[PDB]
Amino acid sequence: FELMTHSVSPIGYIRSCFMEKFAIPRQPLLAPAARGTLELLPPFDQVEALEGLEQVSHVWLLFLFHQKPRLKVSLGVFATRATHRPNGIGQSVVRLEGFEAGRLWLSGIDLLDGTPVLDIKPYVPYADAVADARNGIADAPPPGIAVEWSEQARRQAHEHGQRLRQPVAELIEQCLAQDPRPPEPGRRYGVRLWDLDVHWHYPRPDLIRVLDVAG
Amino acid sequence: EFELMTHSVSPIGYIRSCFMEKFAIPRQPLLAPAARGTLELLPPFDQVEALEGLEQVSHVWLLFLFHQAPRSLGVFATRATHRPNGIGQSVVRLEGFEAGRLWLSGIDLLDGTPVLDIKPYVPYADAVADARNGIADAPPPGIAVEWSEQARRQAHEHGQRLRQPVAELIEQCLAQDPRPEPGRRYGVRLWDLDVHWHYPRPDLIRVLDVAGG
Numbered sequence: 001f002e003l004m005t006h007s008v009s010p011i012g013y014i015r016s017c018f019m020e021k022f023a024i025p026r027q028p029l030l031a032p033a034a035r036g037t038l039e040l041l042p043p044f045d046q047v048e049a050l051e052g053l054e055q056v057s058h059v060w061l062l063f064l065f066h067q068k069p070r071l072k073v074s075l076g077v078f079a080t081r082a083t084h085r086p087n088g089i090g091q092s093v094v095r096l097e098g099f100e101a102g103r104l105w106l107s108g109i110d111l112l113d114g115t116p117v118l119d120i121k122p123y124v125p126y127a128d129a130v131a132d133a134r135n136g137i138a139d140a141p142p143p144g145i146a147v148e149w150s151e152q153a154r155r156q157a158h159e160h161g162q163r164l165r166q167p168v169a170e171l172i173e174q175c176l177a178q179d180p181r182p183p184e185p186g187r188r189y190g191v192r193l194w195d196l197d198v199h200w201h202y203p204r205p206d207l208i209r210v211l212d213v214a215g
Numbered sequence: 216e217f218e219l220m221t222h223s224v225s226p227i228g229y230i231r232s233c234f235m236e237k238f239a240i241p242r243q244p245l246l247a248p249a250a251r252g253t254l255e256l257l258p259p260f261d262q263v264e265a266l267e268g269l270e271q272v273s274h275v276w277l278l279f280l281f282h283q284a285p286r287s288l289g290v291f292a293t294r295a296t297h298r299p300n301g302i303g304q305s306v307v308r309l310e311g312f313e314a315g316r317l318w319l320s321g322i323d324l325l326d327g328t329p330v331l332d333i334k335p336y337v338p339y340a341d342a343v344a345d346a347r348n349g350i351a352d353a354p355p356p357g358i359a360v361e362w363s364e365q366a367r368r369q370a371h372e373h374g375q376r377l378r379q380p381v382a383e384l385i386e387q388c389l390a391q392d393p394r395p396e397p398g399r400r401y402g403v404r405l406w407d408l409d410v411h412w413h414y415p416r417p418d419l420i421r422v423l424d425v426a427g428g
Binding site: 055126 | 275293294302306332333339350
């Protein structure tokens with residue numbers, strides 16, 4: 001009964017460190033160790049589709065959420081970046097580390113592994129960084145929590161980083177500093193990153209301690 | 216494994232805009248505050264609960280269909296209007312809203328544009344002021360604009376009729392240099408108007424006529 005419909009299809013799929021949404025940092029560009037790639041599908045896998053991206057540090061990705069919801073509990077859905085929304089499309093700005101035919105290298109990523117992507121465009125500050133903009137309902141995130149390491153977890157993060165060819169220790173630190181759950185002394189918490197299970201607890205309300213890294 | 220996934224989208228509403236044609240739409244629309252329009256929402260997205268909280272939000276992202284519909288030359292290195300999935304994104308100033316309608320300014324969308332989504336602009340997440348980009352995405356340098364007395368009077372009378380900032384919009388679009396030969400006349404539609412101008416000098420636009428009704 002809709003007056004108009006339009007079909008979209010992914011140009012590619014995200015491979016990334018993130019397996020669950022609550023682990024994704026609220027300020028992902030401050031977690032550069034959160035890395036991923038955009039694997040492009042034909043006919044978009046030739047290098048000509050990307051020519052000019054050498055001059056661009058950041059890109060917009062439009063993508064599909066893994067989804068009639070109008071109220072979030074209460075704010076209107078259009079007053080939020082909630083993930084269950086009309087038409088199911090999200091947007092994110094990510095640092096472009098580099099590219100080759102069929103692949104973008106990304107950092108500071110905030111997308112789940114497997115995310116279907118619909119579009120890539122350059123981020124352009126004069127148009128996109130709006131200095132006069134104000135938003136009183138989006139609380140900017142807390143300053144960030146200190147992270148210490150058990151000796152075992154430091155060794156395990158190193159070993160798995162060497163296996164994965166990823167900055168695992170830095171990712172863990174950058175992810176945990178922004179608080180990935182949902183707090184209680186003693187309780188062991190966990191989060192998945194790449195093919196790892198990372199466990200931690202709160203020795204004090206303002207300190208996280210990494211206990212172990214397994215996988 | 217080898218069948219491309221599909222996903223259907225349908226507009227939540229349609230733009231009513233000052234802009235009827237692509238020519239002269241400002242490349243830096245946030246410096247054209249007189250570029251006004253509305254987003255008319257369709258049920259069930261016209262219910263006021265869907266907007267609760269936007270009173271605290273100065274700017275919104277609109278996702279939209281390039282409704283006028285090839286791999287700065289690769290398509291993914293451009294903000295061109297022909298994109299593989301036909302979806303655009305722009306940020307606009309939210310002037311206000313009520314049930315079923317958003318009032319917008321600084322827009323660059325064509326009249327009739329179908330909109331898929333509205334998102335609040337969130338500065339800590341969306342403003343990367345340090346980001347780098349190529350020369351094809353540099354802002355427009357600007358050009359001087361003068362007015363014939365006739366065009367000044369006509370813009371004023373048409374602005375009163377339409378209850379729109381006609382003279383300001385014309386100046387704000389032409390100052391970004393919609394670009395040229397002095398004898399040629401160029402024009403554009405705005406609302407129900409046709410506006411004409413020329414270049415008496417390479418560094419000067421002069422507005423000649425504002426017609427409509």
